[PDB]
């Protein structure tokens, strides 16, 4: 009993250090206290450090003690220890890869309340991976996740993380000067750095205190965007900036008066929600109308929720779905969630499964677990290929399309040594196959290459021809019809015909400006063979 009091104190000493310091050395000394509680069988410490051991993140990677600490977590009945043991049994990391066992662990992870076992089961029922493909099983599991994401981190949290593809970064590669430009007094540079500090992104960590000083510097300059952003910081509130409607609404009222679209949305929203002012339904709709007219993302979704719920305007679901479908193309999560809640319920639009689940999939793929794309990407750059594929194999399991290709790309180049050389080509074909059926083109060509060369399969020219054709008639990749021409001039998997080969060769010429050169040398070789046939005649 005395160990339990010490272990809980040891966990809280590390948990306080973990939240307050973002340094890599400081985070790893936070996990030095969590690991001590793990040896004392502290429950909530075992969840945090076994995922750290498994993913090679904040601790040195070792699957064997990660798995051993998962089996201690399963007998207790943890929701997060049952889920990640399912991920091991699905990918065969230290175990013999039984999909029958991985479904049992996932189904008990989802009953336990986890939202990764709910995403994975919502993606397996949606794509028919290990189970029967089914709407209604994949809609119940993608809702409980999307209910959490939309309620918790809508804008109370918020995780706008870039989804960077390694194969695209190879084919075409993609802060101090910006900080120095803002140091010279530029209001636009300060607002750009302030947006990159209040929200974060592009490899820059969030800094609420630094964003407040940068926004106030541009606020004195009189920038319209900075004036609304300064009011928004005082409104929502934080540790650095206290929450107060009164000063925030007055500044937003001044911004909405002159020209601010961001100011117009906030001034209407403060009046609509009655944050420090009287509720004015007609004034809010009129103010947010110009916010929709100017093209504000947060204003278009704000007006639709007034008509979908019938607050101020008549319940015109045709007009309500007009705003939400407009805001969805701008990239707003609450537009995606509210659109999918209309399709699934059957109000406004007909009760459609399939449009709901692809809309519930995009709101689910922007949760708190999506930042592990960056941790998997940063571990790829730093030469940790064992810890960059594990964090990419979990997100590949969850249903991501970028992580079903980046995990397959790392396994394709034989870089990741956690899986054997004797298994890595079947494991890379598995995620090329999953990514190709999610509207990705390189994964459709690379599905053709694996059956062309026998990369993990028996060499099958007929199946390679199909995957090259499927990347031509739908996605129109220029390499997909150049490769289609080669199989027609050489007779691999199909009866040879030179006339079709030319057809499919010059199809690449009109489909991309990059194919003008390699079709020129290929048509000339085709012509020389044509010249060779007429000689022997």
């Amino acid at each position: 009993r005395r160990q339990m009091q010490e272990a809980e104190m040891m966990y809280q000493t590390g948990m306080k250090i973990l939240n307050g310091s973002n340094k890599k050395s400081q985070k790893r000394e936070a996990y030095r206290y969590l690991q001590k509680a793990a040896s004392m069988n502290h429950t909530k410490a075992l969840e945090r450090v076994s995922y750290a051991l498994l993913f090679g993140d904040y601790l040195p990677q070792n699957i064997q003690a990660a798995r051993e600490m998962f089996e201690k977590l399963t007998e207790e009945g943890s929701p997060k220890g049952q889920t990640a043991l399912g991920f091991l049994y699905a990918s065969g990391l230290g175990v013999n890869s039984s999909q029958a066992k991985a479904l049992v662990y996932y189904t008990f992870g989802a009953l336990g309340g986890n939202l990764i076992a709910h995403m994975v089961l919502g993606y397996r029922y949606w794509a028919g991976i290990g189970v029967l493909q089914s709407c209604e099983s994949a809609l119940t599991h993608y809702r409980l996740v999307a209910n959490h994401v939309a309620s918790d981190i809508s804008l109370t949290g918020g995780s706008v993380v870039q989804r960077i593809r390694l194969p695209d970064e190879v084919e075409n590669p993609g802060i101090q000067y910006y900080q120095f430009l803002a140091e010279k007094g530029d209001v636009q540079a300060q607002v750009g750095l302030g947006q990159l500090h209040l929200h974060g992104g592009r490899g820059v960590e969030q800094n609420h205190q630094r964003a407040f000083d940068y926004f106030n510097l541009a606020a004195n300059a009189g920038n319209s965007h900075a004036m609304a952003f300064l009011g928004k910081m005082y409104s929502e509130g934080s540790d650095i900036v206290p929450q107060s409607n009164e000063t925030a609404l007055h500044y937003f009222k001044k911004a909405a008066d002159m020209g601010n679209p961001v100011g117009q949305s906030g001034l209407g929203m403060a009046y609509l929600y009655g944050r420090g002012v009287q509720v004015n339904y007609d004034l809010a709709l009129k103010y947010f109308q110009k916010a929709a007219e100017q093209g504000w993302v947060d204003g278009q979704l704000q007006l639709g929720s007034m008509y979908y719920n019938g607050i101020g305007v008549k319940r015109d679901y045709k007009q309500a779905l007009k705003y939400f479908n407009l805001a969805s193309q701008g990239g707003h999560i609450l537009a995606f969630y509210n659109l999918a809640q209309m399709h699934a319920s059957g109000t406004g639009v007909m009760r459609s499964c399939h449009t709901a689940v692809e809309l519930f999939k995009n709101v689910c793929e922007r949760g708190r677990w999506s930042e592990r794309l960056m941790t998997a990407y940063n571990s790829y750059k730093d030469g940790d290929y064992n810890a960059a594929v594990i964090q990419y194999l979990l997100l590949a399991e969850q249903g991501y399309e970028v992580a079903q290709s980046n995990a397959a790309f790392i396994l394709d180049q034989r870089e990741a040594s956690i899986v054997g050389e004797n298994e890595t080509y079947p494991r890379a074909l598995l995620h090329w196959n999953r990514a190709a059926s999610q509207g990705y083109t390189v994964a459709r060509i690379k599905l053709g290459d694996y059956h062309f060369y026998g990369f993990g399969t028996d060499v099958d020219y007929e199946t390679a021809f199909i995957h090259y054709r499927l990347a031509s008639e739908q996605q129109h990749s220029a390499q997909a019809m150049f490769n289609l021409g080669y199989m027609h001039e050489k007779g691999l998997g199909i009866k040879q015909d030179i006339h079709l080969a030319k057809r499919f060769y010059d199809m690449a010429a009109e489909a991309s400006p990059d194919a003008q050169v390699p079709v020129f040398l290929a048509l000339c070789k085709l012509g020389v063979v044509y010249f060779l046939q007429y000689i022997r005649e």
């Binding site: 007998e75 066992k101 028919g128 119940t140 319920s345 399969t457 054709r469």
Partner: protein, 239 residues
């Protein structure tokens, strides 16, 4: 195994309870293939895992119905036949009579001519199968030639083949048109009239269902699952 067991084998988690008997027909089950599982509410369950066989053809195929051409007789006699629209061309297959491919020539509201090109006029114990998108699928072939003559093939007539593939949600529509050789064609038709044939029907992998028996003392099915099934039946039927 690599090619079939990659991810195509469906599993189902079922809860028959403490008083249950393992099935002796279909899939093979072993008493040593098992995992003990405990919920967060301290409800202990025993899940008996299945050995994946999913093999053979012992489905007792007994088909006393008519031939596959008998069902397509109503399709040909109806003469309500499908179209297909592409980038520039438009093939039109017509069931049992003719196959046509054309694009109507159009000037600035002036020209009314047509690129006229015929495709063909329709004047073994193993059913052939076609790899549709990498998955094997049976079909019924019918050949029709004597179309518009091929300029690039020694003035020989154009020959075509028509492929019927069962699809219960389709309405006799053209799936995809391709060429094997020049002036040699195949068209896959998704129609549900011949779905009644067991061999032509949509092949389904057998579900390797999992018995998660209740260890003595626990309820028949976990409590958080039971609350989950209740909400979904509530969310579904109003919707």
């Amino acid at each position: 195994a690599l090619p079939q067991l990659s991810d195509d084998i469906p599993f189902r988690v079922n809860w028959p309870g403490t008083e249950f008997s393992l099935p002796t027909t279909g899939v093979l089950y072993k008493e040593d293939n098992y995992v003990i599982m405990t919920t967060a509410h301290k409800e202990k369950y025993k899940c008996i895992l299945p050995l994946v066989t999913s093999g053979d053809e012992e489905e007792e195929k007994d088909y006393k119905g008519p031939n596959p051409r008998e069902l397509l007789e109503p399709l040909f006699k109806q003469s309500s036949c499908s179209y297909r629209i592409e980038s520039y061309w438009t093939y039109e297959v017509c069931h049992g009579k003719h196959i046509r491919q054309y694009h109507e020539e159009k000037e600035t509201g002036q020209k009314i001519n047509i690129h006229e090109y015929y495709l063909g006029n329709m004047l073994s114990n193993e059913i052939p199968t076609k790899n549709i998108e990498g998955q094997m699928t049976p079909y019924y072939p019918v050949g029709m030639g004597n179309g518009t003559p091929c300029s690039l093939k020694q003035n020989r007539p154009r020959s075509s083949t028509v492929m019927y593939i069962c699809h219960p949600e389709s309405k006799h529509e053209i799936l995809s048109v391709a060429e094997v050789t020049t002036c040699e064609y195949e068209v896959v038709i998704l129609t549900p009239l011949l779905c009644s044939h067991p061999k032509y029907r949509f092949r389904a992998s057998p579900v390797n269902d999992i018995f998660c028996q209740s260890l003595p003392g626990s309820p028949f099915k976990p409590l958080t699952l039971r609350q989950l099934e209740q909400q979904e039946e509530i969310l579904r039927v109003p919707f």
